């Protein structure tokens, strides 16, 4: 019951999920080969949320790996965790995406999506009672953006009532490493609006900032930033897999996170984050974790909450903890900072408490915020967009691939309308 299909898409999608199924595969004591080597029978009661048990107690995930380039697949196969996936789930083309949206959504994506939805139906037809899906992908790539939103817009036609959420990486102007990532991000924000139930917006700068300031790292790679992100994605569905005192599925969040439809863009947060060495000097407590979850410097989205108001938040704690301290800390916050909350919603916070912390510490927590301050993201993109597009730069690589202008102007307007949706719900009483 309550299975989750994992569709990691693109290059970025595969890197995160590579590290994602290195965490989950530690949560449940899965061997690299695929056998089970746990001790506690909590690890197996709800293993089936992610893993198909196969013949002879091997545990094959329900993940599907999609790419338009053979490379990432060959890396994952040849690595520590190649053994863990089913080889019919490594679905990939040959001709690269171009870091071009049109090329992954119309030309070379449509060719492949038939051979992938046929793999979605291998997974969906085997489940007892499916709950949801998930992309792991990148707004600013070819396959992460384009092919991802083709997969999504073809699942709503098949499975129109499952919680489909994304962990999407969004561009930041301080760190640019692709010239047309406004073109590629604009045309996919357009698809995520109408098609998705929850969207966890993650940036790059926000992850260095955690590494530098909080964790006191020296030299971060993609390897290190997604290792964080995977500790968030584990937290989301903890109470789906572990027993808790308050439970909280995918659907439980969705329901009371989201005032209006369409406003389903969340800001995660993790706590605790200490350096090693600086762990014996923090006392680890519920007021300690709460202060990290509401500090701006522990947002994995490169914004400051102080430039708006949280509509709603959820607080997902993992550990042997109290309920008064939880119920109090979450109270003392939305009193002391009552101008940082939308006031037409009483009790902006939802708490959930699991019983099972990560496999090194006690008392973690996860902050998931629906803040109005996320229009800071959508405007920084729609300024770069409108600065290139007024010249019509880089246009022939897009109109060459089956698109036209009118897909742009509408997709620019769909991004600029929801800036005026966070804006309405920030102010006006």
């Amino acid at each position: 019951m309550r299975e989750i299909v994992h569709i990691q898409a693109g290059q970025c999608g595969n890197q995160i999920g590579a590290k994602f199924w290195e965490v989950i595969s530690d949560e449940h004591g899965i061997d690299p080969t695929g056998s089970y080597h746990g001790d506690s029978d909590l690890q197996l009661e709800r293993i089936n949320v992610y893993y198909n048990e196969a013949t002879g107690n091997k545990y094959v995930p329900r993940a599907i790996l999609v790419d338009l380039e053979p490379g990432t697949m060959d890396s994952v196969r040849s690595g520590p965790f190649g053994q863990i996936f089913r080889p019919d789930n490594f679905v990939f083309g040959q001709s690269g995406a171009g870091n071009n949206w049109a090329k992954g959504h119309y030309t070379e994506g449509a060719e492949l999506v038939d051979s992938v939805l046929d793999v979605v139906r291998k997974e969906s037809e085997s489940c007892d009672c499916l709950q949801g899906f998930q992309l792991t992908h990148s707004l600013g790539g070819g396959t992460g953006s384009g092919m991802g939103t083709l997969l999504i817009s073809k699942i709503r036609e098949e499975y129109p009532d499952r919680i489909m959420n994304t962990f999407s990486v969004m561009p930041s102007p301080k760190v640019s490493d692709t010239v047309v990532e406004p073109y590629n991000a604009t045309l996919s924000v357009h698809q995520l609006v109408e098609n998705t139930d929850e969207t966890y917006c993650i940036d790059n700068e926000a992850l260095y900032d955690i590494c530098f300031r909080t964790l006191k790292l020296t030299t971060p790679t993609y390897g290190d930033l997604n290792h964080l992100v995977s500790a968030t994605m584990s937290g989301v569905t903890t109470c789906l897999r572990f027993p808790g005192q308050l439970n909280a599925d995918l659907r439980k969040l969705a329901v009371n996170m989201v005032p209006f439809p369409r406003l389903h863009f969340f800001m995660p947060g993790f706590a605790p984050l200490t350096s090693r060495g600086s762990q014996q000097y923090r006392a680890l407590t519920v007021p300690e974790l709460t202060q990290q979850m509401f500090d701006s410097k522990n947002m994995m989205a490169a914004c400051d909450p102080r430039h708006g108001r949280y509509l709603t938040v959820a607080a997902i704690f993992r550990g042997r903890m109290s309920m008064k301290e939880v119920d109090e800390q979450m109270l003392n916050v939305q009193n002391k900072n009552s101008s940082y909350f939308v006031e037409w919603i009483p009790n902006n916070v939802k708490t959930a408490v699991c019983d099972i912390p990560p496999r090194g510490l006690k008392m973690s927590a996860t902050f998931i915020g629906n803040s109005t301050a996320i229009q800071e993201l959508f405007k920084r993109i729609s300024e770069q967009f409108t600065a290139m597009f007024r010249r019509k730069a880089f246009l022939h690589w897009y109109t060459g691939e089956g698109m036209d202008e009118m897909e742009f102007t509408e997709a620019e307007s769909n991004m600029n309308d929801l800036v005026s949706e966070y804006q309405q719900y920030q102010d006006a009483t």
Binding site: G71, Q94, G98, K174, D177, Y208, P220, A387, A393
Partner: protein, 441 residues
């Protein structure tokens, strides 16, 4: 499989390729007799020799390259030389007389006689490909074969194939140094196919390389052999993310998507930052931060140019080796900070980074030292119009008196063709005047 085709045309095009195909032999661990040695029981097309080397049966590696000349003499340095059994015999195609610094001979008279034999060599390599990427034409503007023949080929390659990338590695005429006096005649006429048929034309010239050898590198007296090892590190890095693993890999098509704004604005100059002599390789701080700044140096350019005279339009960082990205993003943010570096006002988001793990190889007997990191920056700028103004003026001088016209007309072209290729290049130089300028409201 990410396979690619090298075509080496004319004297300069062949003699570069010696320095290219010397290098990949070292990159993938291949002896000059085409053999991988016994210490490679590892994944070959996982080290991906398989983009530049079709593995003949029985452990033997022969390129996907074709060496074409209208003159027998140049390629006969490759037979023997040392590469006499590296190459497939049938991919070394010789004429009998060269075009002889005459575009009309390389394109109409002499070129047509071997053009179908060369296109048929392409098909024998095109049909062995699985996932063909594109072609790498090497030549020089200002030869006869480098200009006349290349123009003939690129027409035929556009018709048969269309879809694939077609990179060029030209040598542009240098403003002072020149050795042919009809050097500008052969450059105006190659303008036609370079903008139309190529997808991305690179330009280098010999003086801007003389600077780097003498100044960054303290070589007293460069020859062509010295310059072309440098050329080859630029191309070796370009095409390295096809064929090695790294985070932020970059295919051949991800250049053009990220480097090239408009249809015919596709003349990006390359640089290369760690050009350091052995002695000067201590007294290094050769971090990522310093080597990113060195790309933006107007002295470290591969073109006689000064980006302080134009605005950049895109850049494109292709790094190799011991690299941490956040060092790069912090070195970008420095680059965006400086006001000596003008991007255009419609770029906003500067540029594309790409990283690769495979460090360069020090070419034996070569000029570089052992560096840990290395960076080409392919970069559109409006400063390459200045290279053109200095060469149109040489053409417009000689064609004012109709000097060497009688050689050209009596070989299979018209007087009328000079007036069309001059207008054609004058329109390019007008495009860069209109692409540097922002629009205001």
């Amino acid at each position: 499989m990410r396979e690619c085709i090298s075509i080496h045309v004319g004297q300069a095009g062949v003699q570069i390729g010696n320095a290219c195909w010397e290098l990949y032999c070292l990159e993938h661990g291949i002896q000059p007799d085409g053999q991988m040695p016994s210490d490679k029981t590892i994944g070959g097309g996982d080290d991906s020799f398989n983009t530049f080397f079709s593995e003949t049966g029985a452990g033997k590696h022969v390129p996907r390259a074709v060496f074409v000349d209208l003159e027998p003499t140049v390629i006969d340095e490759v037979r023997t030389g040392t590469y006499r059994q590296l190459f497939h015999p049938e991919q070394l195609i010789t004429g009998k007389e060269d075009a002889a610094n005459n575009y009309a001979r390389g394109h109409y008279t002499i070129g047509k006689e071997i053009i179908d034999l060369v296109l048929d060599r392409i098909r024998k390599l095109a049909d062995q490909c699985t996932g063909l990427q594109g072609f790498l034409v090497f030549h020089s503007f200002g030869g006869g074969t480098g200009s006349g023949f290349t123009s003939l080929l690129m027409e035929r390659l556009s018709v048969d194939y269309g879809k694939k990338s077609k990179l060029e590695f030209s040598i542009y005429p240098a403003p002072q140094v020149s050795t042919a006096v009809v050097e500008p005649y052969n450059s105006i006429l190659t303008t036609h196919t370079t903008l139309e048929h190529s997808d991305c034309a690179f330009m280098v010239d010999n003086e801007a390389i003389y600077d780097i050898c003498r100044r960054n590198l303290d070589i007293e007296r460069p020859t062509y052999t010295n310059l072309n090892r440098l050329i080859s590190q630029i191309v070796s890095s370009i095409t390295a993310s096809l064929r090695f693993d790294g985070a932020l890999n970059v295919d051949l098509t991800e250049f053009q998507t990220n480097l090239v704004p408009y249809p015919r604005i596709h003349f990006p100059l390359a640089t290369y930052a760690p050009v350091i002599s052995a002695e000067k390789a201590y007294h290094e701080q050769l971090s990522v931060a310093e080597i990113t700044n060195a790309c933006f140096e107007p002295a470290n350019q591969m073109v006689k140019c000064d980006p302080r005279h134009g605005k950049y339009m895109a850049c494109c960082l292709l790094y190799r080796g011991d690299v941490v990205p956040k060092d790069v993003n912090a070195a970008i943010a420095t680059i965006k900070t400086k006001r000596s570096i003008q991007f255009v006002d419609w770029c906003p988001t500067g540029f594309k980074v790409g990283i690769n793990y495979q460090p360069p190889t020090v070419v034996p007997g070569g000029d570089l030292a052992k560096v840990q990191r290395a960076v080409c920056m392919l970069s559109n700028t409006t400063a390459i119009a200045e290279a053109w103004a200095r060469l149109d003026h040489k053409f417009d001088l000689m064609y004012a008196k109709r000097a060497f016209v009688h050689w050209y007309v009596g070989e299979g072209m018209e007087e009328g063709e000079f007036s069309e290729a001059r207008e054609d290049m004058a329109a390019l130089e007008k495009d860069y005047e209109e692409v540097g300028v922002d629009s205001v409201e």
